[PDB]
């Protein structure tokens, strides 16, 4: 039996990438309650007329 | 009545291979809760990056 040191025995591992994405984020569900509007300048102004 | 010895009349039986199966063992159901990876050294090292 060859008495190898501790560091050499610790280097004798194989790298596996099964844990790559970590834990996935929660589902996205903001489109159900919000209205999406695109702005083109410094700010948007909205205006409506009373009855 | 013919007096046959016990050694001759002990051969007067029928061999049946009906118990050959025996008692079956429990089902394998480790594939629903575990993931199978391979290895090629003393151990396996897994690493992932944070968010």
Author numbering:
A (entry chain B), B (entry chain C): 1 to 51
Give sentences copied directly from the paper behind this entry.
It has the capacity to infect a range of intestinal bacteria and has extensive applications in genetic engineering research. Using cryo-EM, we resolved the three-dimensional (3D) structures of the G(+) type phage Mu in both its extended state and urea-induced contracted state, the latter lacking the baseplate, at near-atomic resolutions. The structure of extended Mu can be divided into four distinct regions: the DNA-containing head, the connector complex, the tail, and the baseplate.
Using icosahedral reconstruction method, a 4.2 Å resolution map of the extended Mu head was generated. The local reconstruction method was employed to improve the resolution of the 3-fold capsid of the head to 3.2 Å. The Mu head is constituted by 415 copies of the MCP gp34, which are organized into 11 pentons and 60 hexons, thereby forming an icosahedral shell with a triangulation number of seven. The MCP gp34 adopts a canonical HK97-like fold. An asymmetric unit of the icosahedral head comprises seven gp34 monomers (one hexon and one-fifth of a penton). Despite the absence of cement proteins at inter-capsomere interfaces, complex and extensive interactions are observed around the 3-fold and the quasi-3-fold axes, including hydrogen bonds, salt bridges, and electrostatic interactions. Analogous interactions that reinforce the inter-capsomere stability within the head, independent of cement proteins, have been identified in A-1(L), T7 (47), and R4C.
